[PDB]
Amino acid sequence: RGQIQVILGPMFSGKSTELMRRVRRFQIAQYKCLVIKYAKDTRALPACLLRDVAQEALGVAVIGIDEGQFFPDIVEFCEAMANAGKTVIVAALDGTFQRKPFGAILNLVPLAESVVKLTAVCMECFREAAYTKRLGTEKEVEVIGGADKYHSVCRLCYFK
Amino acid sequence: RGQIQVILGPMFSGKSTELMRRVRRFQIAQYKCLVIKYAKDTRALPACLLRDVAQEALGVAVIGIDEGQFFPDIVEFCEAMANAGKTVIVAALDGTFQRKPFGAILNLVPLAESVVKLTAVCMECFREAAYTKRLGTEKEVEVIGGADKYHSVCRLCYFK
Amino acid sequence: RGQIQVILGPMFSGKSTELMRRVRRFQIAQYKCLVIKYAKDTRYSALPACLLRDVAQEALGVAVIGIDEGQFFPDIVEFCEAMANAGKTVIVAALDGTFQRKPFGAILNLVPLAESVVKLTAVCMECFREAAYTKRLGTEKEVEVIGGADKYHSVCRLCYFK
Amino acid sequence: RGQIQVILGPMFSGKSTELMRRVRRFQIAQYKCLVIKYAKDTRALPACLLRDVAQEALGVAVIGIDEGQFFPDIVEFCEAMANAGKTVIVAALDGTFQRKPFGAILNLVPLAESVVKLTAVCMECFREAAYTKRLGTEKEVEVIGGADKYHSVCRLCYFK
């Protein structure tokens, strides 16, 4: 009985922490677990493509993926692992700094048995934040960074 | 202080009921409300394009949209209404009978402050259902119908 | 495989609507369902009862039981626990707090027995932010006073104490 | 604008982890935070009574409380702090090993703006667990321990 669970939200909403909470629940109950992280975010197997890690994932019952937006093969991997009877849990940004779909990640939603969107605190007005604002002027989608380069932000502060 | 809330799920998960629950909360507190329904679902203003109802929506504080996947202008409408300070609540299928994104509806996710995926009961094995199976052989995406044409289904029953 | 699900929240949060949404999911899938309402709440908008024991026999022939306004049944705990242990799905909509923000009857005893517990939210009728509580408008002091928005406001913390 | 949030669940459901997730959200946004833990669970200020820690809590905007069931003054403390404009977040067991209310903790529910009940994995059948079973024969409520002394369990496994 396989499954895909998706944890969405802006930056600073605790997506990775929620991923680990969910994974630890199975681990403490003696399930074999594997967590995959995107190798280029360096601020628990590192990977750039999920296929590079698929043999390790096959010998496990529960798979966690952190920063799923950066994996070009996120959809085919999760779907194949869930159909092989694995529980797959994915933490990911739903939107880029432009509030557009981040990579292929939203194609998981129609495939998922569970989808949640977490919330952050607006770093500018301190209300609830749904979005991520880029502070600099860089235009490319992939720019690795933390609170130095990004603010979690509400709708009003996003457009300010 | 505008916002977009999205209620996703397969068929038979009570998306419309949850939309009404949320809308009634505001209405009981004296907010002016408008509910829009897709005119072609024959099975509360009917509409085929949201632009056709934009004038009525402008004089209201809370807008509910049922079956949002069928409006080709869902994204621009919701984003415009939320930026104009309105609370927009959207009930929508996330997936077609093929478990692919239904129209443009997933582009709302990165723009929404709240996203939830509801669950149905599998009509074939009676466990939790996340998907919709088409019973017949028709291949086009838009085919209006209820439990006579569709089953809410789990992963296993979907592929049976 | 029985179950207790609990839907909490202040007044005007849509607890009854969420109850019905959950019950209809099972019904549309061919499960036999029963909904029980508190007989003394005769407000405009499904078996009426004052004690859940009085409808136990009907409940035994069904797979899914919904209970509206569970706070008013003195036998809520033993009924739900017995039905869930007999393999039924029991769904309970109830106020968690009185107008005094105190536990409403025996209803919180269900929480340690329940596999699912949610607390819904209302809109503050005085400042229009999120409301978690119910304020009584009049001066009556007894717990049980039936009424709607004529007698009660859903209210935030600050408006509750105003 | 003060607030009480309550995180309930059986053992091994990640209540502490969810508490920290929520606290870190505020901290990363520059709020002053304090976390209080029950001093007698020695498996972040330790305390036996919340009143012993009330002066520290007054100089802070966000207060987290771990294992709230063990503080006899949980209700008056949280209510007082929330009315003073603080955000109070409480992780706690809802039920003892006998599935009875654990201390005074349920009296927080009618005072709280947010209440959630987390789930664990059944350590005996591996389905969803809502309860905690004591493995030994000791009869007193307070017995500190982990997976050595307790299993998270479903309804059926609880009564087996």
Ligand SMILES: Cc1cn([C@H]2C[C@H](O)[C@@H](COP(=O)(O)OP(=O)(O)OP(=O)(O)O)O2)c(=O)[nH]c1=O
């Ligand atoms: C918004 C955005 C982020 N990023 C990068 C910045 C970060 O390195 C990474 C975000 O990782 P996350 O793990 O999503 O960021 P986080 O740790 O703040 O979130 P959480 O607390 O929820 O775990 O993605 C982009 O490259 N492009 C973008 O448009």
Ligand SMILES: Cc1cn([C@H]2C[C@H](O)[C@@H](COP(=O)(O)OP(=O)(O)OP(=O)(O)O)O2)c(=O)[nH]c1=O
């Ligand atoms: C799955 C699927 C449904 N449909 C149609 C069938 C229905 O008429 C409509 C589904 O609308 P819904 O409002 O999703 O159906 P519902 O009433 O069961 O929903 P709920 O109980 O959650 O309120 O879309 C398609 O046209 N194509 C598809 O691929």
Ligand SMILES: Cc1cn([C@H]2C[C@H](O)[C@@H](COP(=O)(O)OP(=O)(O)OP(=O)(O)O)O2)c(=O)[nH]c1=O
């Ligand atoms: C708060 C409170 C309510 N009541 C009564 C008033 C109502 O008759 C009943 C509350 O029923 P509800 O069904 O909780 O109220 P509702 O129908 O407005 O809420 P929802 O939208 O969530 O369904 O209890 C008391 O008798 N004493 C009290 O202290």
Ligand SMILES: Cc1cn([C@H]2C[C@H](O)[C@@H](COP(=O)(O)OP(=O)(O)OP(=O)(O)O)O2)c(=O)[nH]c1=O
């Ligand atoms: C069920 C139960 C637990 N305990 C004790 C045992 C532990 O020391 C403590 C457990 O509190 P928790 O913090 O709930 O234990 P946990 O670490 O499993 O929690 P989580 O993973 O959700 O963060 O309570 C009792 O004393 N009596 C009881 O009846």
Ligand SMILES: [Mg+2]
């Ligand atoms: Mg991260």
Ligand SMILES: [Mg+2]
């Ligand atoms: Mg519908």
Ligand SMILES: [Mg+2]
């Ligand atoms: Mg009601």
Ligand SMILES: [Mg+2]
């Ligand atoms: Mg703990």
Ligand SMILES: [Zn+2]
């Ligand atoms: Zn802001």
Ligand SMILES: [Zn+2]
């Ligand atoms: Zn099935």
Ligand SMILES: [Zn+2]
């Ligand atoms: Zn208010």
Ligand SMILES: [Zn+2]
């Ligand atoms: Zn079990």
